[model samples]
Target: ENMFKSKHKLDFSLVSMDQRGKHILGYADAELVNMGGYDLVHYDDLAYVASAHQELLKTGASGMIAYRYQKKDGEWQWLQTSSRLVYKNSKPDFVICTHRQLMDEEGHDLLGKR
Candidate 1:
């Protein structure tokens, strides 16, 4: 495999100088999606969102934001994730969701600038 052919145990076509590997991973996941939002999550989607953030940190994009929601059962929920985006080919080149779970209290700003 290409990954195994690389310096590591796996072959790598690209490597990040800033984020190490996080930025590229985030970009890969974001490319697979058509939109960017908290409402677009299923179980697997949530997992990928979290992974992107964790891996893409070697780059200088060390920022994140959470998207919260109010359920119909009167429950307040947070998206439990965040991301950074790079534009390419007129689309989101990638997304790295580095921070997960920050909402612990009400009135918390999920969209505030970091």
Candidate 2:
């Protein structure tokens, strides 16, 4: 909500997962998790996100991607999110993801900018 209201600025959030990449704590925001009156986490996209996490776990590198979300008004919005692993004592503690709304040259949202 703040991100949308602020015109693309992001607020940080933490998610904890185990070695198996299971969500142990916290969850994605409703806009991403449940958008357009349904879940928009397409299986392929979820697999891609999971792959990125696995890469982060293996290499400790941040990963980013653009994905789709549905606004409350039923418009699709594009967002770019990046995640990094946080470690405590050389072990994984949690993950932080920052989301930024994507826009086109004309200053319109990128979902279907035209």
Candidate 3:
């Protein structure tokens, strides 16, 4: 909120992994894309999530990843994300994930720890 100097909205997207790979099935908001040139679900650094997912699955764990998002004007920001796997009748169903823009200091600290 401080980063954008507002009560940053918490937007969400239903994500799934297909035979072809991960994709956004739907979203709660399009403002992210409308302004930033990227959707709430897909981004270049999503590979970080993909890689983390694989490791988590082996141990039946949730996952988290933080990556940078560059706006059209070349200003970069950090997006901190976390996802929990939803299951249906003992089988993997989909992921319920949340993405929030972290403040400059918070982002740097998180990235530094990682």
Candidate 4:
């Protein structure tokens, strides 16, 4: 909404998400050409999210940071865009991160207990 208030319309496409917005980015495509640009392995890794967010911003969504590394050839490059929260189905069933966020206080105690 802020972007519209400032006067800007984003142009993009629905790559992997279902009609209702559910599924992982790039789930519908391969690497590089993937919607999110990269696949996510561990939700605890912020680097993956950072990468996805970068891909989303190409369409004008705010809050994106792309992660990159220099290749052996001495060229800076991106591993992939793997940030931003994605959803699957009508529910917020995107990544495990969302599930972890819902971890109850007992979860914390359990961690300590262990």
Candidate 5:
């Protein structure tokens, strides 16, 4: 329409993990998806992403970070994760994350492109 570009709504997935941010919760099969939270993340973004994980663990602060995650097929994709410390029985038990695939406003995924 205009000379500028447009942004679209994101498709997000909700995943819950342990407070330590090690593994994904709510999944029954252990052997198949044994990888932990950080395990799915791209190694290059590991340190910085882990920083947010550790910070949330220590201070119970909510974390908002964008990083790359490897899908089951070993496909690296960019994602934005907003994690919150979920409290239960007056104590924080799990971390609930709202994860969405990161994409450019110009109709492209933020993984690799020209």
Candidate 6:
């Protein structure tokens, strides 16, 4: 709760995650449109993201997590992301994900090890 966007009411970059190819179906807080959803995730964390994603694919959600996502300026900043799979009745719809940047101290620790 002591994060950067915590001062604001909420972070607004909600993207619709399509599981088929892990593409972005649509975005509510649109800024860029050229890249896929997985494009934002750093390669160092992709392997971990997949395992977490596959586990959630069965359970319907992934709890909060830390990963490196790129900034508009090309700097790779770490972030906190949570993805909740939304289903229309029994069939699946898309994934609703929340995004936030991490504090430098918290992120630096992960930098050395992850």
- Which predicted model would earn the best lDDT? 6
Query: What is candidate 2's lDDT per residue for 61-111, written digit by digit as tens?
Result: 544455554444455555565666667698766555555556533223332
Candidate 2: residue 104 Cα off by (Å): 7.5
Ranking by TM-score: 6, 5, 3, 2, 1, 4
Task: Report the C-alpha lDDT of model 5 over 1-114, residue by residue, as the tens digit.
Answer: 111111111111223333222222212335324335566567877776667777776776544445776644555555566656667798766666655545434214332331
| Root-mean-square deviation per candidate | 13.4, 10.2, 9.7, 15.2, 10.8, 8.7
RMSD of 5: 10.8
Candidate 5 displacement at residue 44 in angstroms: 0.8
| Highest-scoring model, TM-score | 6
Could you give candidate 3's per-residue lDDT for residues 1-112 as a string of tens digits?
A: 3221111111223222222111122122333333321243246556665565666455544445466755434566666655555576887554454556666687767765
Clashes of each: 17, 0, 0, 11, 0, 0
- TM-scores, all candidates, are 0.27, 0.48, 0.49, 0.20, 0.58, 0.63
Weakest ten-residue segment in model 3 by summed lDDT: 2-11
Q: Candidate 1: where are CA atoms >4 Å away?
A: 1-62, 69-74, 79-82, 85-92, 106-114
On a 0 to 100 scale, what is the lDDT of residue 90 in model 3? 88
Model 2 CA lDDT for position 34: 19
Q: Give each model's whole-structure lDDT.
A: 0.35, 0.42, 0.45, 0.29, 0.48, 0.54
Candidate 2 segments exceeding 4 Å error: 1-40, 72-74, 104-114
lDDT by residue for model 1 (28-98), tens: 43433332343434443454434444554344243334444333344444444333445558654654333
Model 2 gets an lDDT of 0.42
